[PDB]
Amino acid sequence: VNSFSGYLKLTDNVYIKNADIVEEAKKVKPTVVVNAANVYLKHGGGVAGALNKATNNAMQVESDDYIATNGPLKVGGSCVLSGHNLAKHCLHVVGPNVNKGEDIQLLKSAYENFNQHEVLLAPLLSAGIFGADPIHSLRVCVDTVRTNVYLAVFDKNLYDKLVSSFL
């Protein structure tokens, strides 16, 4: 038994809810929240801008030190950093940016990072401002992640489409 409430169960391990991931993380304080990161950990907008704003920019300060030491992530890659006031840890995962001509096949590699964590609160990777089809992202998630993932969909019309079209 865990603290997540109000989710629809899609599969043995994947759950979904219409929720603001920021508000969900603040309420639940999960072990792991996933950020929709870019390779530079520049948290300007979308999920990343919203998570970073909720940390009062502490996520960005920590991220800039990480990049100064390690250089950029790979597309499809991840790093574990602090969750600040939102979670114990933040798993920063880089989904492909379709708007940058970045291979959609890298979305499966991105989701494989979730398998290193038993339970996660996450957005749909490469959705929103990363330009991928969120229906596709949900399918890759279900077919790739084996650990328990609680998906936060900000768009209610999209949430309802994802549920109503789910095979």
Ligand X SMILES: O=C(O)CNC(=O)NC1CCCCC1
Q: Which residue, 55 or 130, is less far from ligand X as judged by CB?
A: 130
Beta bridge partners of residue 14, listed in sequence order: 149
Q: Which stretch binds ligand X (CB under 6 A): 32-40, 81-89, 103-111, 148-156?
A: 148-156
Q: Does 123 bind ligand X (CB under 6 A)?
A: yes
Q: Does 154 bind ligand X (CB under 6 A)?
A: yes
Q: Which stretch binds ligand X (CB under 6 A): 29-37, 84-92, 114-122, 127-135?
A: 127-135
Contacts by 102-108 with C-beta closer than 8 Å and gap 24+? 102/75, 103/75, 104/132, 104/136, 106/75, 106/76, 107/76, 107/132, 107/136, 107/137, 107/140, 108/140, 108/143, 108/144
Strands (E), the chain: 8-9, 14-18, 32-37, 78-82, 89-94, 119-122, 148-153
* Beta carbons of 133 and 139 less than 8 angstroms apart: no
* Beta carbons of 137 and 158 less than 8 angstroms apart: no
Q: Does 158 bind ligand X (CB under 6 A)?
A: yes
Q: Please state the closest distance from residue 65 (CB atom) to ligand X, in A.
A: 29
Q: Does 134 bind ligand X (CB under 6 A)?
A: yes
Q: Which stretch binds ligand X (CB under 6 A): 23-31, 79-87, 96-104, 147-155?
A: 147-155
Q: Please state the closest distance from residue 70 (CB atom) to ligand X, in A.
A: 28
Q: Please state the closest distance from residue 126 (CB atom) to ligand X, in A.
A: 9
Footprint of ligand X (CB under 6 A): 123-124, 127-128, 134, 153-155, 158
